Amino acid sequence: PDSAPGQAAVASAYQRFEPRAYLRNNYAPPRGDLCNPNGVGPWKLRCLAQTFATGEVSGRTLIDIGSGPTVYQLLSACSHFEDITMTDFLEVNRQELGRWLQEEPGAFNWSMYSQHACLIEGKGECWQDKERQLRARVKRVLPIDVHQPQPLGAGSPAPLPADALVSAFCLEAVSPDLASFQRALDHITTLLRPGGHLLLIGALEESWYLAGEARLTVVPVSEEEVREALVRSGYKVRDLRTYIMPAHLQTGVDDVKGVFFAWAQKV
Template sequence: GRGGGSVINSGLAPAAAPGQAALREGYEHFDPRAYLRNNYLPPRADFSSEEFVVPWKLRCLAETFASGEIQGRTLIDVGSGPTIYQLLSACDHFEEIVATDFLAVNREELGRWVRGEPGAFDWSPFIQHVCKIEGRGEPWQDKQRRLRQRLRRILPIDVHRAEPLGAPLRPRADALLSAFCLEAVSPDRASFVRALSHVGTLLRPGGHAVLLGALGESFYLAGPARLPVVPLQEADVREALAAAGFALRELRSYAMPPALRTGVDDVDGVFFAHAQKPVGMGR
């Protein structure tokens, strides 16, 4: 996802950080179709080699969910953007998936795919690839059907509010997933840590968090929108998770090869993190 989280401040400081105002402005022009073209068609979505970025992301997710440790009733995806690839391995382990995004255009794009409407983005190459790497010999149509059945709610979210969904999630989610959202809606690292803490409240103590995000990225394009991103290094991700009260289980990173540096952003790489909310944490 991207265009996730939010771009409206909590309302506590009306003149909030100029960074937030710039973000809010940028996301008004966010074009989901341009974003999908830039990131989820070739060259980035090339399945001919595991060395490409999309297969790398899908493999991280497949391997992490294959352990069977991350499962339960509900998984919440924070800042889904217009994408569903991040849910393909997760969907087998939860009864319900809650997708969320700040932007109505992204929620509409997701709804079109869930309903199988003509003109929805074609995720079938992604679903086929995930079925292949999971190696269960499952027809990809079965996985597509399962995800559509389990993706029951697509909700508005604002990760800069202490209550990101506007009300507590009851019961809290057993797992939280977030892909390319928090760093893309935070003007600085402190704001990234706060957003992580806010979304952490949606997760039950003992619950797992799986994050994908950009490393060393300062902007990305989505049609007419040029959106600022807080550039993170691996160390920043470790520190932010610790500061937000998560115990890091695994951190992997991917260096973007020159052929995939297409000018739609200035990303250096991608991080994948698996963390857990300690059981002793009341919030």
């Protein structure tokens, strides 16, 4: 079956994606409340911090796939990669990132996430040094379409192949069917060198989430399907953890049942 139709549907829906609302729905309290150790924020940050602390994920270059208007996914990573490439389909998201990069006041304040990262990394790093390091190591913010055989376009900047990939809430939020998800994964995988690592975070059993006016339709995937897709793309799953969304965190911004975190290494 042709993908174009579904892809065109996805592309269209995102043209109504709103950064501001997106950030508030998912990265402001209650979801953006890092105080409760059992919330989703802390758990995500713990997964990333702990994986990097094994020292097994290192290199020079890293590419964040579908960054959106967020940087939390790179807080623990920036102390291990000198060259970081951020990416997103939407220009308005790339501007939102540019806004934070310029330390402008009208930008989202990630300090809460930064402090927590420094907190669990346990190196007595103050969050300001942490944010400073990230801003310095983000070498580029590029456009991307995971549905293309070459997601970054052709002859794009991004040093290739990247030593590591990081991607949160992208693949499953932009793929019509499960076959698309698998294809999307194979496409970004061509950006990672053999032996490289992939840090993937995502929503489990989700069909919709809100980005302001947007009521984006998402393909629900399970742990089993993610694991299966990772192996089908040539990865050895090194770690796959699941977080069950608590009742108090089901604010009505989406219908997500859980969140997965996968650490896979390209074979």
